[PDB]
Subunit: 386 residues, 4 copies
């Protein structure tokens, strides 16, 4: 029941099942996984592919010969399993050199190094077939007000993304960028903290068509925002290039629980939206198996990510297909929300006495919205109580 | 000491000092203020002007003759005092007809009424000299997932703002719009919940040059965001048309405390930014005197708004003018943040072996940022300990 | 399916289905309900009983003769329907006189009035058969630091509850008190803000056996706390006298959604705990039907409260009865958590070399907890996927 | 100006200035400090003493001979500098064996090991002169609902603290315990999450007089609570045995900023309370110098902790000594809050017609509280604007 297949397009980062369990108060509880073993085990679970930071695949500082060895072994595991690599990204946060950021470090030489490190991994991503290149600026930000002039930092961030766009254009690469927002952690405040801030920033880039967002469930919930609403705005703007799925219990540290944990009803409404809108990209899981777990629990937690997506997919589909729900949607006037307010135009609106002078406001105000009956139908469907 | 003058451009909404103290758990503690008395008392405190919702000035349902009487009395108080009206807005949230929103109500007839009510007040705002027209969509949103299709609602919101822009264009009015974001309250989630979401939405309007943001201190802090950072992004995009100042103690209900209360250090960094960037618009206070207060406390709380801005202005100016601070800013490389990362261009960067092949990452990583010394200088200046 | 009966002990406040929809930004959307009609309609839905504030039943300021008329009509509706009144409470928050609190108002004459108003309603509660008397100090608190000396205010709060205990003791009444915590709203910070603070305060009262807590789902979640955990501590201390059920979406204004909305998984774990622990008191709903709703939606939202409790009860029971779950609980060592750490005593522990000198820490650390498999079984049961 | 002396009783944990900068997303930015060097440098800054976890001083796994060497070197640095060790604590969170907790681990053998590890360090603390022994149960908690039965876990937590109390009693030690609450991180929810929950738990211990709380500024603010209010309740109960000072910017990960950063006004009201109440214990800083800093920034950040306390001490003292403030306090009736509500007793209250039958509620309600004028005097004093 609810078994994934590679046609479901489920993907996982190497750093997810490979997380050793080191947290700010404790040492690792699990040994390191060989990327090749992770590819094999994920393929057996029904995954479609994997993603990586440069430093997940090729340890930092590797020689060019060591680098080719790591890539060759990885490429062989992909050939043996049929797994794909749809997305790649750059680690610009672990090494101490990035302690004040990568693209927006105050030190100019660090910003130049950050760009060269990114460009080298874009070449590798293209070689392995990635369609999307993610940028998470986890160190771009500040703990104190005077440390970062944010207008100058946004100039530097625009400069870096513009240069990356010039690079992929000049090389003829068919790859697009997705910016991943996060409000805080590990910096006290991170630049571009939500989906909205990232979407607004993209419109000031030289080639905006090359850039979209990679929102993550838990990150928007770290600001107490409604994740399905933010995804809807990203889809409305045509900018949902990729998505990271996980779980989060409210406003606190980034928990990265398996998908379906955390806010379960928000997960239901997210799956409903993605499937209704026909989102075609990977269903990527950026999660951490809790450090309480051994390797058997790692694979159980990864399987649960996919299982929970498929259960919610079934329940949302049953909800939308239910004739009683379709009738409730009409009773709450969702059909009228989809019709233009004034297709007759401004002048007709101004001359329409039924829109103001003769509008019965008391009769309109007395109409109930019937939203609670609709939401209880949604509850019953989620819980399998119809 | 720290006495405001009308050249300081401090403004107040009629609904601020006029708040009767009704909250969700209690009845009013103060009687209603006549708008004329509020104008007179604010002028004596040193304010520059006032702002209004249509329904603050002209009670809902007034006849055309009653309406002219209310406006004439108001215009006379402005002439007698020298007060200005730089901003106006529409009440699309109090009346029960707006219980599911104004521009994005599911009912089409309500959306048409909302537009006609707004258009009528734009005419009045222009007559009284307002330069900015604010839109706060406080009822645009949902408490449950199925009640609002957010892509359709954004279509309806874009339709409404586009029609308003066509109206002001066709009338030849010199007025601009500012969208006021809020994450929640009174709806469970509100559409366009942060400055970032509003900025991104504006770029999809037909005439984006007519629209900017009106951020409010407490609203961004209701999502745990850094308000100075959000203001910096708005300034970077050229979209800070107006600003609402108040105080808020963290993530909870919208408190609307007087400016300077709440997060005091954030207030310091906000004033530093506005004065450094040369923001020219009104310093508007959207605050509520606590319902514990009588009318003497109302005026004391309004005076405190202005006093706290002027004290912080002095401390931020002393901070930036201090030679020891200028030297600390260079020590933390704020000068290098303002220089281009790669004015030499992409190809020069790619050929620069000092940017990657021969870059000493360990030497760069060992450089301290000196941010804590800089932040303690900022503390000492804020507290007057130098 | 899932139909409530009065043996399920579901109760509702008069102020819940009777909420007219007035919020801080909008006027009422529904007319007022006669308490008699609410009793009748709740009885038809399957409720067990109702609760009231004094001012819900007898309008503020009523004459003694008007008061007897209101009570007589109410008592007749109870006799006609079979409904019970298991809990009553005092309104010490709506009237302007209580704007700085009731029991901890700075004005001494207000504190004396608050006590007399409470005592008069305790007599009425006993007459109507209430077993529990709830105190929610919604105005006890402050918006600013100097306004309230909290040690003096706690002295005044202890004084008031001690006097109430002396009153019920002297009258021979069989009624107990339950303190309802809330962290904020309508005051900026409220005294006794969480279940823990209330439990600690009770232990300093003269007759602690007369006092317990009345926790509310949404209130603990307004501080980001785990509501099932707090309930477990209240049960562990023997102090869960009553409980208020509703829903809340994270850290924001008090939403009072119907039970099951908000954090659905927390609702599941709460029902599991209450049923496992054999909690015997009322399942009381303190919720507000959204102001979008007409009266048909009011009754639909009230029915949904009860439906969601009964569905979750079924799923939690199936979870605990599943042999595969019982085996998973043993695999995660929940059986060992219930055994004493050192029933052999301190000296035996100190002499036990297997507890320190010869303890294999690396072997113990390598044991996986198997919590993710257990939690996915819980998910599958909640969703009806087994 | 504002120079600390050891009579100010400022203390620091070895783990604070010794933090190497490892966070969940990045490697260490600073080398390790020798405890002896930290003692010397803190003594030169004006500190009174230091605190330690067992594993800060004696690396985990040390032989008995290595252990005596580490202690002897440490004792010599204390003799050379005059520094004191007023508090010690146990590391029950870093080693993987503690991944499901120490005192409340599901595995019984782990709970026994946790107790033996604690008991061994209590002996060392007494030898070095510590008066308080802190317990922070950072791993006691859960990420999922079924993993931890909280009633059983509280039984195990009570068992462990009772055994520790029996141990210190049997040894004749003059040391007391302080429980440190935290709401979350590194567990998803931590048991005893706030000061209130810890105070309530203590009252169920066998020898409650031996146990108090060690609240931390940032931890209560992680739940959005008012830290001065919580400290006032701890003082009211006689349980403030120790305190941890730092800074925190709202509800997010535990930032551990230097004291005075974060919520500055809350720091002002905290210092006012501690000095007014005559708190006599150490002013202990549990903070982390940001990983952006080199060792010069470490010592600058530690100095700033002490400087900010001394500046706030001066401003709070000036506030309370100002005759205009004393008059404002009387105007807001803080004097009446300190008087008994009903020293005349219950029967006199019941017979007092001025308390109910003849009480003018409208006249009392019309009295303004004058809190905004009082709070602006407090602002002016904090900022040095009088
Ligand atoms: Mg994350
Ligand atoms: Mg991610
Ligand atoms: Mg506001
Ligand atoms: Mg505003
Ligand atoms: Mg509530
Ligand atoms: Mg309640
Ligand atoms: Mg901390
Ligand atoms: Mg601490």
């Amino acid at each position: 029941n609810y078994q994934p297949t590679p046609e479901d397009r489920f993907t996982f980062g190497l750093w997810t099942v490979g997380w050793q369990g080191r947290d700010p108060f404790g040492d690792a509880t699990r040994r390191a996984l060989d990327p090749v073993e992770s590819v094999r085990r994920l393929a057996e679970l029904g995954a479609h592919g994997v993603t990586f930071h440069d430093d997940d695949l090729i340890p930092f500082g590797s020689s060019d010969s060591e680098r080719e060895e790591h890539v060759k072994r990885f490429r062989q595991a992909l050939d043996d399993t049929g797994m794909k690599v749809p997305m790649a990204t750059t680690n610009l946060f672990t090494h101490p050199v990035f302690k004040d950021g990568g693209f927006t470090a105050n030190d100019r030489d660090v910003r130049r190094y950050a760009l060269r490190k990114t460009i080298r991994n874009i070449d590798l991503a293209v070689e392995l077939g990635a369609e999307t290149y993610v940028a998470w600026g986890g160190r771009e930000g500040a703990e104190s007000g005077g440390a970062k002039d944010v207008r100058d930092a946004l100039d530097r961030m625009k400069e870096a993304f513009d240069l990356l766009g010039e690079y992929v254009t000049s090389q003829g690469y068919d790859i697009r960028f997705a910016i991943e927002p996060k409000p805080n952690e590990p910096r006290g405040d991170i630049l571009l903290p939500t989906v909205g801030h990232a979407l607004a920033f993209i419109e000031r880039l030289e080639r905006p068509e090359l850039y979209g967002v990679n929102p993550e469930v838990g990150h928007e919930q770290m600001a107490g925002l409604n994740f399905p609403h933010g995804i809807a705005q990203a889809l409305w703007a045509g900018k949902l290039f990729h998505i990271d799925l996980n779980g989060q219990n409210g406003i606190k540290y980034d928990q990265d629980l398996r998908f379906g944990a955390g806010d379960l009803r928000a997960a239901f409404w997210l799956v409903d939206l993605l499937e209704s809108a026909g989102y075609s990209g990977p269903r990527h899981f950026d999660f951490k198996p809790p450090r309480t777990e051994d390797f058997d629990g790692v694979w159980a937690s990864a399987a649960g990510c996919m299982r929970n997506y498929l259960i919610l997919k079934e329940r949302a589909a049953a909800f939308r297909a239910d004739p009683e729900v379709q009738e409730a949607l009409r009773a709450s006037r969702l059909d009228e929300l989809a019709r233009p307010t004034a297709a007759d135009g401004l002048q007709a609106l101004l001359d329409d006495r039924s829109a103001f002078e003769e509008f019965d406001v008391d009769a309109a105000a007395a109409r109930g919205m019937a939203f609670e009956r609709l939401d209880q139908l949604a509850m019953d469907h989620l819980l399998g109580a119809r």
